[PDB]
Ligand binder design. Structure first.
Ligand SMILES: CC[C@H]1/C=C/C=C/C[C@@H](C)[C@H](O)[C@@](C)(O)C(=O)[C@@H](C)[C@H](O)[C@@H](C)C(=O)[C@@H](C)[C@H](O)[C@@H](C)/C=C/C(=O)O[C@@H]2[C@H](C)[C@H](CC1)O[C@]1(CC[C@H](C)[C@H](C[C@@H](C)O)O1)[C@H]2C
Ligand code: HEM
Length: 397
């Protein structure tokens, strides 16, 4: 039985070597949480992917923690989200939301997103001396963008700005997250009303129209969905941007490939998505098995058991990715699991990609001599929260 969480290595740029040790040895392992209880972790791409794709696993591992709230908004909402549903229930929702959350909407949103970035860089360029990229760019952009998509804007945004950061909270800070949540549930309750009697081209405007029409889609679901989207896409993207730049700056010979060559970027982004993970599980909530399961390597996972898809290392599996533990931004073959797989596959997978693309491009393009205001050594990740995020990222150029 192995101790999980693992040790957190010295560098922010390295991972627990314990991960590769397992993936290339026993591959499947059982683990114990402090807590005491026994779980299981899979490490192979095949296996990880099976866990997410196979329908004998369940994402209902928080179902009592949410009932045990419930009565807070936080808990009402853990019960109401996609990422926590299964079976038919999840299918109905995902289906309903995609009637408006489509690749097309997202594709068409790229131009705005470019401006949203340009603008934040326009403010970045009038701030003084070394400047923290986290506070001033990485944390704000994805909300802006989620706002633009939802139909919040654009007054209302210096308020939202508060509620949103409250949720960036270090996961222990429950009372302060519970507060913002509530402000948001009412805020969106209101926004609906106004969007209904003056729609525009945005996610909510569309959902209402669906909901008002001939469909079971209710205002509450819309609200849940709208927040689900925020929580899910905010911390996430914000962390990655910073991490990515760091990683690039760490590998200057791989970064030089993206200089003066903007068509190289979509590939670069997917390589970092692969190589630079959210967590060990790549932000994926542990699945628990609804029944017993046979794996690639022969091992069998028992029914009623917690399972950790360890995406962080499955995305370096040498069976799949040739030269996997090194960053190749030219990589053409790269079927990474950063956005998961199976029915829970990131709803914002394309959007994320666009944001990240647009962000790098703009930085490279407008601030190409961008160096860390020094140094790799001093960087430090956030104690809590859960996602691998930098506390700050002072940069100069
Ligand atoms: C890598 C797995 C972690 C999942 C992260 C998922 C992130 C998704 C992303 C959308 C956000 O971070 C988030 C919205 O989901 C999120 O942060 C929420 C979970 C947020 O924390 C929210 C539920 C809370 O405020 C949280 C404090 C809850 O109120 C609290 C009741 C959670 C209790 C809890 O026991 O769960 C923790 C949690 C899953 C955490 C972390 C789980 O810790 C748990 C899981 C991991 C460790 C090993 C143990 C095991 C546990 C599953 O038994 O303790 C595990 C026990
Ligand atoms: C780098 C950025 C992002 C990464 C790495 C990421 C990764 C993931 C992963 C791994 C899952 C699956 C979790 C699970 O299987 O339990 C997921 C689900 C989800 N993602 Fe993201 N995501 C990112 C950004 C976004 C953004 C910007 C949105 C915006 C709308 C979004 C929409 C959410 C939603 C709503 C789900 C749940 C879908 C469902 O369960 O059916 N994500 N994400």
């Amino acid at each position: 039985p192995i101790a999980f969480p693992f040790p957190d290595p010295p560098s922010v740029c390295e991972l627990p070597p314990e991960l590769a040790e397992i993936r290339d040895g026993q591959s499947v392992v059982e683990v114990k949480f402090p807590d005491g209880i026994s779980g299981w972790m899979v490490t192979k791409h095949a296996d990880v992917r099976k866990v997410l794709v196979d329908s004998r696993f369940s994402s209902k591992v928080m179902a009592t923690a949410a009932a045990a709230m419930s009565e807070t908004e936080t808990g009402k909402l853990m019960n109401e989200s996609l990422v926590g549903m299964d079976a038919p229930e999840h299918t109905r929702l995902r289906k309903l939301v995609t009637k408006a959350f489509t690749a097309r909407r997202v594709e068409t949103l790229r131009p705005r997103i470019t401006e949203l970035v340009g603008q934040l860089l326009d403010e970045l360029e009038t701030l003084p001396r070394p400047v923290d990229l986290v506070k001033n760019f990485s944390v704000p952009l994805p909300v802006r963008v989620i706002c633009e998509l939802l139909g919040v804007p654009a007054g209302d945004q210096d308020t939202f700005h508060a509620w949103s950061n409250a949720l960036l909270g270090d996961w222990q800070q429950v009372v302060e997250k519970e507060a913002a949540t509530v402000s948001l549930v009412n805020y969106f309750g209101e926004l609906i009303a106004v969007k209904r009697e003056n729609p525009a081209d945005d996610l909510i405007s569309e959902l209402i129209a669906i909901s008002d029409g001939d469909s079971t889609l209710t205002e509450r679901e819309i609200i849940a969905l709208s927040i689900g989207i925020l929580s899910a896409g905010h911390e996430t993207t914000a962390n990655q941007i910073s991490m990515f730049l760091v990683t690039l700056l760490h590998n200057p010979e791989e970064l030089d490939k993206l200089r003066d060559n903007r068509e190289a970027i979509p590939k670069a982004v997917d390589e970092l998505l692969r190589f630079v993970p959210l967590t060990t599980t790549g932000g994926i909530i542990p699945r628990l098995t609804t029944a017993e399961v046979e794996l690639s390597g022969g091992q069998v996972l028992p029914a009623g058991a917690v399972v950790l898809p360890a995406v962080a290392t499955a995305n370096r599996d040498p069976e799949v990715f040739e030269d996997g533990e090194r960053l190749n931004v030219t990589r053409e073959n790269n079927p990474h699991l950063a956005f998961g797989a199976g029915i829970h596959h990131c709803l914002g997978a394309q959007l994320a990609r666009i944001e990240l693309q647009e962000a790098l491009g703009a930085i490279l393009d407008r601030m190409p001599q961008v160096r860390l205001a020094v140094p790799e050594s001093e960087l430090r990740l956030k104690s809590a929260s859960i996602i691998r995020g930098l506390e700050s990222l002072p940069i100069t150029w």
